[PDB]
Amino acid sequence: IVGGYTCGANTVPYQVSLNSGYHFCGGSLINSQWVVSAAHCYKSGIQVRLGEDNINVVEGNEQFISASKSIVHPSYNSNTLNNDIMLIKLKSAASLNSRVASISLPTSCASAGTQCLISGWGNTKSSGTSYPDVLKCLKAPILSDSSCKSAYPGQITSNMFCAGYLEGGKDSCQGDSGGPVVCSGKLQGIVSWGSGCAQKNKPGVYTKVCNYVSWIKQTIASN
Ligand SMILES: [Ca+2]
Ligand code: NA
């Protein structure tokens, strides 16, 4: 997260860190056994880390649970990032409480101009590299489809939306991938891609979760 703020410990209780010996992506807890992330975050060996603030210090509220199964979207295209969504099933159920909690799936898609909360442990610089230990947050508005398509001509599908600031300076970034975009208490986006981070006229691009709710529900009900 570039240009954001320190969230505060466990104030984003649905945020997870995906670990393969090191933090590599975010995710969102949607019930006690399932996490939603980005398909481009797929790795063979994944441990889900819930209740994290500092990802390099055991502070007392963590749950570390290995994945039993990953399910990349059937239509995921790694070239275009169309359908950049994956479900991860936990080997054992998380214990839900104040610091570890699920985020609701959307019934409606999100509205242009809604300010959403984007969070993660990704790079905090638009040029250079600095990775935080504690969870970072950003308030960012949903941009119109027209503005998004103008920013990334020939690249935005119906399964993507832009959020952030055309002036630059505030955005998600590498290492935030797979994490949440929460708008009005619903998971509306997944950190997916962008040209650099926090660059002028190059806002973040996010997987449009409202298009996948039927797939998510059907998949959870059968696995
Ligand atoms: Ca920790
Ligand atoms: Na809704």
UniProtKB/Swiss-Prot annotation:
Cofactor note: Binds 1 Ca(2+) ion per subunit.
Active site, per annotation: H40 (charge relay system), D84 (charge relay system), S177 (charge relay system)
EC code: 3.4.21.4
Keyword hit for Zinc: no
Compartments it resides in: Secreted, Extracellular space
Protein's GO biological process: digestion; proteolysis
Positions with a binding annotation for substrate: D171, S172, Q174, G175, S177
Keywords: Calcium, Digestion, Disulfide bond, Hydrolase, Metal-binding, Protease, Secreted, Serine protease, Signal, Zymogen
Regulation: Is inhibited by scorpion cyclotide trypsin inhibitor TopI1.
A molecular-function term among this protein's GO annotations: metal ion binding
Cystines in this chain: C7-C137, C25-C41, C109-C210, C116-C183, C148-C162, C173-C197
PTM section of the record: Subsequent cleavage after Lys-125 leads to alpha-trypsin. Further cleavage after Lys-170 yields pseudotrypsin. A cleavage may also occur after Arg-99. Not sulfated on tyrosine residue(s).
Main location: secreted
Peptidase S1 domain residues: 1-221
Transmembrane stretches, start-end: none
Subunit organization: Interacts with SERPINA1.
Name of the protein in question: Serine protease 1
Gene: PRSS1
